[PDB]
Amino acid sequence: ALVLGWMNALYFTRGLKLTGTYSIMIQKILFKDLFRFLLVYLLFMIGYASALVTLLNPPACRDSETFSAFLLDLFKLTIGMGDLEMLSSFILLLVTYIILTFVLLLNMLIALMGETVGQVSKE
Amino acid sequence: ALVLGWMNALYFTRGLKLTGTYSIMIQKILFKDLFRFLLVYLLFMIGYASALVTLLNPPACRDSETFSAFLLDLFKLTIGMGDLEMLSSFILLLVTYIILTFVLLLNMLIALMGETVGQVSKE
Numbered sequence: 001a002l003v004l005g006w007m008n009a010l011y012f013t014r015g016l017k018l019t020g021t022y023s024i025m026i027q028k029i030l031f032k033d034l035f036r037f038l039l040v041y042l043l044f045m046i047g048y049a050s051a052l053v054t055l056l057n058p059p060a061c062r063d064s065e066t067f068s069a070f071l072l073d074l075f076k077l078t079i080g081m082g083d084l085e086m087l088s089s090f091i092l093l094l095v096t097y098i099i100l101t102f103v104l105l106l107n108m109l110i111a112l113m114g115e116t117v118g119q120v121s122k123e
Numbered sequence: 124a125l126v127l128g129w130m131n132a133l134y135f136t137r138g139l140k141l142t143g144t145y146s147i148m149i150q151k152i153l154f155k156d157l158f159r160f161l162l163v164y165l166l167f168m169i170g171y172a173s174a175l176v177t178l179l180n181p182p183a184c185r186d187s188e189t190f191s192a193f194l195l196d197l198f199k200l201t202i203g204m205g206d207l208e209m210l211s212s213f214i215l216l217l218v219t220y221i222i223l224t225f226v227l228l229l230n231m232l233i234a235l236m237g238e239t240v241g242q243v244s245k246e
Contacts, residue, residue, distance in 0.1 A: 114240025115143035
C-alpha cells in the first residue's frame with residue numbers, strides 16, 4: 001500500500017505545470033508490453049528447458065528433472081545482465097534462441113519507446 | 124518449430140487494434156542489420172586474432188594456435204557485457220579496435236532505431 005500510494009502521487013498530481021506527459025506515457029506503456037514480454041519469456045524458457053529434458057534432464061543445473069523457474073531466474077540474471085553458466089561449453093538450439101530473444105527484446109523496446117514518445121504524444 | 128509458431132503468432136495476428144506497427148518494424152529490422160553486425164564482428168575477430176598469431180599464437184587463451192570462435196565467445200561475453208581477460212595487462216591494436224567496434228555498434232543501433240521508428244513509420 002505504501003508503494004501504491006507513492007505511485008498514486010506520481011499519477012494524480014499532474015497539475016504542476018507541463019512536464020512532457022508522464023501519466024499518459026504511463027497508461028500508453030503501463031503494463032501493455034510487460035505481459036507480452038512475460039509471455040514470450042516464459043515460452044522461450046519452457047522451450048529450451050524442454051530441449052534440455054529431451055537431451056539430459058531425466059545439464060548446467062545438475063540435470064535431475066529440477067525446477068524450471070530457476071531457469072527463468074538464471075535467464076533474467078545473466079542473459080539479461082551477466083555471469084552465465086555457459087550451460088553448454090545443446091548449442092544449436094541455445095545460440096539461435098538467445099539471439100532471437102535479444103532481437104525480440106530490442107525490437108519491442110525500441111519500437112515501443114520511439115513510436116509512443118514521438119508521434120502519438122500530443123503532449 | 125515451437126518458437127517459429129510463437130513468432131508466427133506475433134506476426135500474423137496484427138488485427139487486434141492498432142499498436143504502433145510491430146510487424147512492419149520486424150520486416151524493416153528483421154535481419155537486415157543483424158548480418159551487417161555479424162560480418163563486421165567476424166572481421167574484427169579475425170583481424171585481432173591475426174594480430175595475436177603474428178605476435179604470440181605459434182596470449183590470454185594459452186597462445187597455442189587455438190580456435191578463434193572462442194575469441195568470438197569472449198568478445199560477446201565481456202566486451203559486450205563484462206568480465207574481460209584483460210588480454211594485454213598488443214595494446215596499440217586492441218584499444219583502437221575495441222573503441223572502433225563500440226563506435227560502430229553505437230552508430231548502427233542508434234541510427235537504425237531512430238530513423239526506422241521515427242520517420243518511415245506511417246504507423
